[PDB]
Symmetry: C6
Amino acid sequence: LQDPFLNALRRERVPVSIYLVNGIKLQGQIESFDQFVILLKNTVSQMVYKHAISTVVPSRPVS
Amino acid sequence: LQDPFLNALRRERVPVSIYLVNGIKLQGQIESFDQFVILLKNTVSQMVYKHAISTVVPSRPVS
Amino acid sequence: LQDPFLNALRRERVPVSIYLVNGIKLQGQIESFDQFVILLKNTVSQMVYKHAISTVVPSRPVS
Amino acid sequence: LQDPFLNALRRERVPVSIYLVNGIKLQGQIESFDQFVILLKNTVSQMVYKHAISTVVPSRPVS
Amino acid sequence: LQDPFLNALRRERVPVSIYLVNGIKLQGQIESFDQFVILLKNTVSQMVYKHAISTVVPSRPVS
Amino acid sequence: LQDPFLNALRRERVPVSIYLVNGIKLQGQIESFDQFVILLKNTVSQMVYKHAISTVVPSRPVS
């Protein structure tokens, strides 16, 4: 489920919110990902560990 | 235990609360799931990592 | 150790407190369990992920 | 390292503090343990998941 | 994705922020890393466990 | 990276701070370690689970 969901966000360059396990919300666009991290682009590319992610939320409906 | 419990919620489209490991409560309907994530539908589909889930709670009894 | 401890609680239908890793306390009776989840019955059955459990505490001595 | 450290506490029945990953302190005596849980005896036996333990601290020096 | 991202930061000795799963921000330069830890240099070398990292953020764009 | 870093601290008996995933700071000297725990000596030996450690920080430069 992960790969198609993440690929749709990446491909359509949709703004997303990534909530971390502490409740902090990161925003930006999904640049790339593997089974361990997601690169999230805003002003810089920041590397997010999936193990610290609770939920990924598109800013608008994404098929 | 997971798959039958989650499938019943999905199949009956019952509103559920998903509590995360930080105490945040997400609400909506179970769209689909695998061994790593749950897609939770409200206004958008958001992807929840199971490793960040503490408990899934049906809004009403579900056989 | 887990299986006998949990089975005794289930079999004797003793009220228990399940503390989560965030400090939240859930209460009810152990309905069933596997190596990943515990079903905890109060008004509904809710599915608790063991990875988010810190401690399970019987309301009274349980052999 | 775990097994000898925990066995010494168990064998000598020394009061210990078990701090959880949320900062909550549990107290009592080590009843038994495996690679997944520790049974901690105070008034009841409560089952503590090792994955939710940060540190185990003897109330006094223990060889 | 991890190794090239981390190597670029290390090689260019760029100041970074490492956010932990509790929200605490550590700052300094990436000295070295393996699949388990990152050594982060400020006044001393401190060893950060990757399992406690949520995100690594460069202070400026880094190719 | 872990073993040489931890061994240097142990061998030189340097005071260290061990920060846990909840932000609590433990202090003392590294007595011993394996892939699962670190024994941290202050007045008593306390056993710290590595999975609950975010960072280990020497009180002074340590080669």
